[PDB]
Amino acid sequence: NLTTRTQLPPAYTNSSTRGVYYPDKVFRSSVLHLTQDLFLPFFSNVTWFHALHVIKRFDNPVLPFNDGVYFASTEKSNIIRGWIFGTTLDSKTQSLLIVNNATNVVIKVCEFQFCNDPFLGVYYHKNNKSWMESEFRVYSSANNCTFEYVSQPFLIDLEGKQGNFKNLREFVFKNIDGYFKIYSKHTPINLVRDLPPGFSALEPLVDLPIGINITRFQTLLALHRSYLTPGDSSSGWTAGAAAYYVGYLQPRTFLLKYNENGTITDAVDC
Amino acid sequence: ISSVLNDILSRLDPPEAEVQIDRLITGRLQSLQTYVTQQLIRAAEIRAS
Amino acid sequence: ISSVLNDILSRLDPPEAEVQIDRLITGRLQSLQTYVTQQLIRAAEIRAS
Amino acid sequence: ALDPLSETKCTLKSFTVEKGIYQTSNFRVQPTQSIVRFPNITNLCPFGEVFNATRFASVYAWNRKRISNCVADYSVLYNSTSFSTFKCYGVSPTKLNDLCFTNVYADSFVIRGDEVRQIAPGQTGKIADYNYKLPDDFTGCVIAWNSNNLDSKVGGNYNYLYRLFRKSNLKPFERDISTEIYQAGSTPCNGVEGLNCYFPLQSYGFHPTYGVGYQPYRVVVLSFELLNAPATVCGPKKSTNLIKNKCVNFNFNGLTGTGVLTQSNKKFLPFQQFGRDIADTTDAVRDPQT
Amino acid sequence: EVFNATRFASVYAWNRKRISNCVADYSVLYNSTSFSTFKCYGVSPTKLN
Amino acid sequence: MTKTSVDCTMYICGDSTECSNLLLQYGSFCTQLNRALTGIAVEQDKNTQ
Numbered sequence: 001n002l003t004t005r006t007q008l009p010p011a012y013t014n015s016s017t018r019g020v021y022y023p024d025k026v027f028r029s030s031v032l033h034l035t036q037d038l039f040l041p042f043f044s045n046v047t048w049f050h051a052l053h054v055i056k057r058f059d060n061p062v063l064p065f066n067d068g069v070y071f072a073s074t075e076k077s078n079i080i081r082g083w084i085f086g087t088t089l090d091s092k093t094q095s096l097l098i099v100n101n102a103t104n105v106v107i108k109v110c111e112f113q114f115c116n117d118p119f120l121g122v123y124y125h126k127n128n129k130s131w132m133e134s135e136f137r138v139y140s141s142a143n144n145c146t147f148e149y150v151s152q153p154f155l156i157d158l159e160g161k162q163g164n165f166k167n168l169r170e171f172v173f174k175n176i177d178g179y180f181k182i183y184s185k186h187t188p189i190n191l192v193r194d195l196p197p198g199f200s201a202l203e204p205l206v207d208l209p210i211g212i213n214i215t216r217f218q219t220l221l222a223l224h225r226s227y228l229t230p231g232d233s234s235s236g237w238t239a240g241a242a243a244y245y246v247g248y249l250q251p252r253t254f255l256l257k258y259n260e261n262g263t264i265t266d267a268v269d270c
Numbered sequence: 271i272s273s274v275l276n277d278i279l280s281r282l283d284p285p286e287a288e289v290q291i292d293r294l295i296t297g298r299l300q301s302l303q304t305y306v307t308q309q310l311i312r313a314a315e316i317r318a319s
Numbered sequence: 320i321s322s323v324l325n326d327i328l329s330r331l332d333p334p335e336a337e338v339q340i341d342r343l344i345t346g347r348l349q350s351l352q353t354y355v356t357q358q359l360i361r362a363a364e365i366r367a368s
Numbered sequence: 369a370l371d372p373l374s375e376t377k378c379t380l381k382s383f384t385v386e387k388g389i390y391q392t393s394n395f396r397v398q399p400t401q402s403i404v405r406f407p408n409i410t411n412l413c414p415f416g417e418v419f420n421a422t423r424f425a426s427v428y429a430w431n432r433k434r435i436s437n438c439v440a441d442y443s444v445l446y447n448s449t450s451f452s453t454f455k456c457y458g459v460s461p462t463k464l465n466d467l468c469f470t471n472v473y474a475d476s477f478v479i480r481g482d483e484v485r486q487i488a489p490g491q492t493g494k495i496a497d498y499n500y501k502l503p504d505d506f507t508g509c510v511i512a513w514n515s516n517n518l519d520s521k522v523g524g525n526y527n528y529l530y531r532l533f534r535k536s537n538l539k540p541f542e543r544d545i546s547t548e549i550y551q552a553g554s555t556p557c558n559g560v561e562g563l564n565c566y567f568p569l570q571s572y573g574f575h576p577t578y579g580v581g582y583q584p585y586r587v588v589v590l591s592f593e594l595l596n597a598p599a600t601v602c603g604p605k606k607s608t609n610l611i612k613n614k615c616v617n618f619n620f621n622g623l624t625g626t627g628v629l630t631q632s633n634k635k636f637l638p639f640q641q642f643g644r645d646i647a648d649t650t651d652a653v654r655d656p657q658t
Numbered sequence: 659e660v661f662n663a664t665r666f667a668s669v670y671a672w673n674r675k676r677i678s679n680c681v682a683d684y685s686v687l688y689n690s691t692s693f694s695t696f697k698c699y700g701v702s703p704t705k706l707n
Numbered sequence: 708m709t710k711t712s713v714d715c716t717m718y719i720c721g722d723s724t725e726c727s728n729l730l731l732q733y734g735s736f737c738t739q740l741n742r743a744l745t746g747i748a749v750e751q752d753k754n755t756q
């Protein structure tokens with residue numbers, strides 16, 4: 001459902017000593033603690049995905065999901081807006097949707113019949129400057145739904161397309177015993193490329209009782225367009241600048257340091 | 271099932287808590303005996319010096 | 320019930336197997352402790368010599 | 369326990385003591401009062417809407433519900449319900465009145481009479497492999513009771529379904545509601561069923577005159593964890609005012625102990641309730657009220 | 659022949675039979691037989707496959 | 708060398724009445740351990756002498 005996809009081989013990089021999350025909910029102060037669990041090994045191969053246009057790079061493929069995943073997003077404008085999880089991504093199996101549509105964040109578990117290339121779209125008007133999310137194509141139908149959650153309404157800016165990336169978001173996804181575990185973290189940052197090395201905690205965010213079988217996942221993006229050539233498919237889009245990186249988790253034994261205030265500060269990969 | 275006596279005494283009745291209490295007692299007695307033996311050996315060396 | 324880890328792991332599920340594994344672990348730890356203590360005593364005698 | 373000389377006599381296991389220094393045990397202080405601190409919870413827990421429901425779910429599409437802001441006073445069920453099977457795994461039943469639970473979930477479905485034994489860790493069979501599975505380290509309780517007068521019809525009730533064929537066994541707490549065509553032989557089914565193609569769901573045949581092994585039974589499974597993760601469902605106990613700077617027996621959200629309580633300068637994160645020392649012992653705790 | 663037999667022996671003259679050269683796939687009994695009691699002693703059921 | 712003393716019931720049970728009612732069966736062990744430690748302590752003062 002989209003064209004104009006000038007291509008080039010993908011990139012690669014490593015990960016710094018980042019991707020550590022709180023393993024439990026017990027306060028500990030000034031401790032060295034050894035734990036074995038599913039973590040992201042230090043200095044691991046990481047793929048790099050762009051979203052820009054000088055090129056018309058969009059980069060929303062389907063990637064394997066195994067033993068959890070680690071997702072890092074660097075951006076200055078809200079473009080990456082959710083994810084889709086499932087096993088066949090068809091109407092014969094159940095699937096999970098998490099997406100933010102600029103007013104609400106919605107989580108759903110249904111029998112979605114997904115599109116081959118889903119996205120969201122914002123349109124830029126003339127004279128009366130405005131952006132009112134004039135496009136949303138993620139699926140065709142959803143019949144049997146067992147889980148549903150919608151948040152309280154809000155609003156967010158939509159263009160912001162100046163300067164370099166000024167926001168960094170970290171997410172860790174795991175699936176164990178019918179529970180989908182999400183850990184999250186946010187950080188201000190000023191950079192141009194090449195996710196900075198550093199260390200940060202990954203405080204727990206949510207646990208959902210979905211109870212499904214997950215093997216693959218895909219990323220949800222939003223494109224903003226304006227007065228250009230018509231004919232949505234070959235009609236131009238102006239996805240400004242965003243990047244997302246993906247890493248895979250493995251079982252490892254780590255050593256953690258708990259500070260005086262109860263905050264994890266450093267770790268060692270045995 | 272745990273390293274804290276309070277948790278065991280809070281979650282279990284006496285007949286079932288007795289087993290875990292016995293296991294902990296044996297372990298800690300073994301630790302104390304090991305400490306005493308090492309102290310005796312070090313004391314012998316110090317006496318020679 | 321057996322002296323081989325593989326047999327226990329092949330005939331029993333984990334929740335019925337940790338007990339046998341724990342018994343074996345305690346026994347082998349005790350054996351190692353005894354060996355270390357005897358080595359310490361012999362080392363003291365050799366030091367005097 | 370009379371005098372230090374008597375204590376030395378008891379320790380020495382004799383009636384005569386020579387001259388020495390004879391180190392005794394220690395300085396010991398006994399508590400004076402007992403205190404209880406439970407959160408502010410008033411509403412009774414919806415036992416009627418769960419147990420006394422008009423209809424249950426099919427076993428393959430089992431139902432899961434979340435329970436919060438409750439007072440778990442299960443005596444109310446004593447006059448209305450009679451349970452054939454009731455078994456807990458992580459706790460002793462007699463302690464259920466002195467605890468607060470954190471992440472309670474209730475699972476409901478209906479099965480045949482001869483299959484209640486399969487709702488247990490480590491079991492195998494049709495239900496334990498294709499429909500509903502429990503984890504190895506399960507902490508919770510299982511309740512099952514006969515429902516012949518409700519789920520049986522004279523002509524035969526054909527609303528409850530179960531799966532019969534599957535390529536592989538399920539994982540604990542996993543659901544599967546696909547209705548494809550199962551291939552048993554070698555010729556591909558390519559859609560429509562045939563000689564070696566089957567519809568994987570069949571309906572229980574419930575009649576009011578069948579044997580006890582074929583009559584329907586209702587099953588409810590309660591799952592929770594106890595100590596960490598500050599709780600929301602609590603039992604029927606009365607709170608008392610806090611006593612500090614004195615050695616007392618304390619019960620904080622189900623954690624029992626003895627000691628003295630003082631103010632602290634620590635600051636807990638919003639998702640933390642307990643704090644332990646180096647040797648895995650509880651030393652800090654938040655207060656449910658205030 | 660074993661489970662779906664037309665006649666069973668008396669308890670005092672109980673019957674014994676030898677089994678050999680099988681592929682023991684007990685999944686084929688699901689649609690025809692319902693078992694009231696099933697207990698295994700030397701092994702865990704989940705390992706029977 | 709440093710002189711040390713150990714209290715069993717405080718280290719093992721640690722202020723509990725359900726415990727320390729089970730240590731009685733093992734009580735005769737503690738009186739042994741102290742007789743070792745005391746034997747070290749009195750020795751130390753002799754060394755300096």
Ligand SMILES: *[C@@H]1O[C@H](CO)[C@@H](O[C@@H]2O[C@H](CO)[C@@H](O)[C@H](O)[C@H]2NC(C)=O)[C@H](O)[C@H]1NC(C)=O
Pocket residue numbers: 101102103104106133150
């Ligand atoms: C984003 O998606 C949500 C998903 O429902 C939309 O939510 C609406 O919420 C209102 C108030 O609860 C309901 O009355 C509507 O039925 C919901 N559906 C819709 C599509 O209106 C929300 O409106 C969406 N926001 C945008 C900007 O599209």
Ligand SMILES: *[C@@H]1O[C@H](CO)[C@@H](O)[C@H](O)[C@H]1NC(C)=O
Pocket residue numbers: 013014015043
């Ligand atoms: C990891 O990446 C950084 C920056 O990209 C680089 O300086 C470093 O040499 C890399 N380390 C390894 C082991 O590849």
Ligand SMILES: *[C@@H]1O[C@H](CO)[C@@H](O)[C@H](O)[C@H]1NC(C)=O
Pocket residue numbers: 012013014044045046
């Ligand atoms: C990552 O994997 C790709 C694919 O084989 C490989 O070309 C690249 O060298 C790898 N990078 C690292 C740092 O291992």
Ligand SMILES: *[C@@H]1O[C@H](CO)[C@@H](O)[C@H](O)[C@H]1NC(C)=O
Pocket residue numbers: 125126128129130
């Ligand atoms: C801006 O103008 C466009 C058409 O020119 C209109 O569709 C849109 O609603 C306007 N936005 C406002 C008035 O906020």
Ligand SMILES: *[C@@H]1O[C@H](CO)[C@@H](O)[C@H](O)[C@H]1NC(C)=O
Pocket residue numbers: 143144429545
């Ligand atoms: C799933 O959807 C189909 C389509 O209507 C329906 O026939 C079937 O009963 C549904 N299964 C459920 C609700 O479990």
Ligand SMILES: *[C@@H]1O[C@H](CO)[C@@H](O)[C@H](O)[C@H]1NC(C)=O
Pocket residue numbers: 259260261
């Ligand atoms: C704890 O946080 C306070 C915040 O005011 C800070 O001053 C203090 O140094 C921190 N303690 C540490 C880092 O050990």
Ligand SMILES: *[C@@H]1O[C@H](CO)[C@@H](O)[C@H](O)[C@H]1NC(C)=O
Pocket residue numbers: 416417420
């Ligand atoms: C309980 O179920 C019975 C059906 O036998 C019904 O008559 C009664 O109204 C129900 N009560 C509540 C409180 O749900």
Ligand SMILES: *[C@@H]1O[C@H](CO)[C@@H](O)[C@H](O)[C@H]1NC(C)=O
Pocket residue numbers: 447448
């Ligand atoms: C208990 O149930 C019986 C049902 O026969 C009823 O007669 C009685 O009034 C009930 N008592 C209470 C206290 O609910």
Ligand SMILES: *[C@@H]1O[C@H](CO)[C@@H](O)[C@H](O)[C@H]1NC(C)=O
Pocket residue numbers: 087213214215536537538539
């Ligand atoms: C989960 O899905 C994969 C891919 O279809 C499949 O191979 C696997 O058997 C499924 N797991 C279960 C428990 O059915």
Ligand SMILES: *[C@@H]1O[C@H](CO)[C@@H](O)[C@H](O)[C@H]1NC(C)=O
Pocket residue numbers: 408656657658
């Ligand atoms: C709980 O109830 C007590 C009743 O004495 C009251 O003093 C306290 O403020 C209440 N706290 C909350 C959080 O409701």
Ligand SMILES: *[C@@H]1O[C@H](CO)[C@@H](O)[C@H](O)[C@H]1NC(C)=O
Pocket residue numbers: 662690
């Ligand atoms: C069991 O034997 C009877 C004999 O009358 C036969 O009708 C039936 O089909 C057999 N069942 C199976 C599963 O072989």
Ligand SMILES: *[C@@H]1O[C@H](CO)[C@@H](O)[C@H](O)[C@H]1NC(C)=O
Pocket residue numbers: 566689
């Ligand atoms: C399973 O048994 C039922 C009840 O007799 C029967 O109707 C159905 O055809 C059987 N299925 C197969 C595949 O034999």
